Amino acid sequence: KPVQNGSQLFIKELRSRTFPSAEDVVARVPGSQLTLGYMEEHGFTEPILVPKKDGLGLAVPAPTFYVSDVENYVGPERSVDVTDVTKQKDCKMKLKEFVDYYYSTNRKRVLNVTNLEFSDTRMSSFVEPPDIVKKLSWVENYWPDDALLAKPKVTKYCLICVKDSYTDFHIDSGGASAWYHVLKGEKTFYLIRPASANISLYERWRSASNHSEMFFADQVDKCYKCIVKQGQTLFIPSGWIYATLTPVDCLAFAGHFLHSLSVEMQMRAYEVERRLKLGSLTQFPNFETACWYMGKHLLEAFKGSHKSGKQLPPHLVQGAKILNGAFRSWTKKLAEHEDELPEHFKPSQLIKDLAKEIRLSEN
Ligand SMILES: O=C(O)CNC(=O)C(=O)O
């Protein structure tokens, strides 16, 4: 039976299939313990489920917030990306038209909105990302408020998924990490660890002509099933390959971020991404610019290291090496990389300044 990913038959079969529980890799942590200390101690290599919002500093509206309200705050005439799940093709319509669809009592289509970034709408002020995200995020920490280049617009997403909707396996753009909060309903995540062969398998799969006919989880040793219920929050680490299935109508909020715990994986994903040459819809805008700002901050931290005699932790120094490599790669090359370079940056001087500083540290 040659079925397509996201088809009614596929979903039907996917619902009945058995998966190792995410009990094996996903840590349950109360909102208050999810601190910079916790993250630094553990290294954010595994998904984290926070069952209850308390202590997260997450701000969301009450579950009494319906799809019709989203239409009201966002704007019924706003253009929105809509995935037809069963075709696995994307299209664009008015929010009001999707809403009309959502409230139909005989939907003949399976349609989701998963790309709706609402930072530029009246709905923005109803949602604030978890404090830990603000703490880890490169953009939040290191992208100046007065920058000439617009911040990456990936901070506040509203997701509206109907029953039996499916998003196929993917790595988030930029190897970015993610938080997902389920406001109403539930969402099932299928989580695959970014072990080196898994990433390599994922690239070959995603680049195969007939990937939409192949269930990726069939190719890996372990694909963990994680149900995220109403009121719960999931944090997905850099590089994890995941898909989702929505067992009932679901409303969720989400955001993407880069952080210093996963410099290596972030660059890896980015490289996979630039090879696949796909997407251009869910892409992490100005990933490279965020890296440039981080390079600057690093050079500024290495230097402060001389006034402190307090060397930099190994993972930052190794981050420096990775970013410097990427910097060298993007420059003297080539003609589109320049478009992501922040004002008043001297690419050549930063690179040499960082190489020396890394040199000094190792010595
Ligand atoms: O639909 C999905 O599960 C994938 N979601 C996204 O990448 C996002 O916008 O956070």
Swiss-Prot record:
Tissue: Widely expressed, including in liver (at protein level).
Post-translational modification (record): Phosphorylated by PKA on specific serine residues, leading to the formation of an active lysine demethylase complex.
Binding site for 2-oxoglutarate: 114, 167, 180, 187, 242, 244
Binding site for Fe cation: 170, 172, 242
Localisation: Nucleus, Nucleolus; Chromosome, Centromere, Kinetochore
Consequence the record notes for mutating residue 170 to A: Abolishes demethylase activity
The organism's place on the tree of life at top rank: Eukaryota
Domain JmjC intervals: 118-274
Record family assignment: Belongs to the JHDM1 histone demethylase family. JHDM1D subfamily.
Function: Lysine demethylase that demethylates both histones and non-histone proteins. Enzymatically inactive by itself, and becomes active following phosphorylation by PKA: forms a complex with ARID5B and mediates demethylation of methylated ARID5B. Demethylation of ARID5B leads to target the PHF2-ARID5B complex to target promoters, where PHF2 mediates demethylation of dimethylated 'Lys-9' of histone H3 (H3K9me2), followed by transcription activation of target genes. The PHF2-ARID5B complex acts as a coactivator of HNF4A in liver.
Entry remark concerning the domains of this protein: The PHD-type zinc finger mediates the binding to H3K4me2 and H3K4me3.
Subunit structure: Component of the PHF2-ARID5B complex, at least composed of PHF2 and ARID5B. Interacts with HNF4A and NR1H4. Interacts with RELA.
Entry protein name: Lysine-specific demethylase PHF2
Origin species: Homo sapiens
Region of the whole protein represented: 80 to 444 of 1096
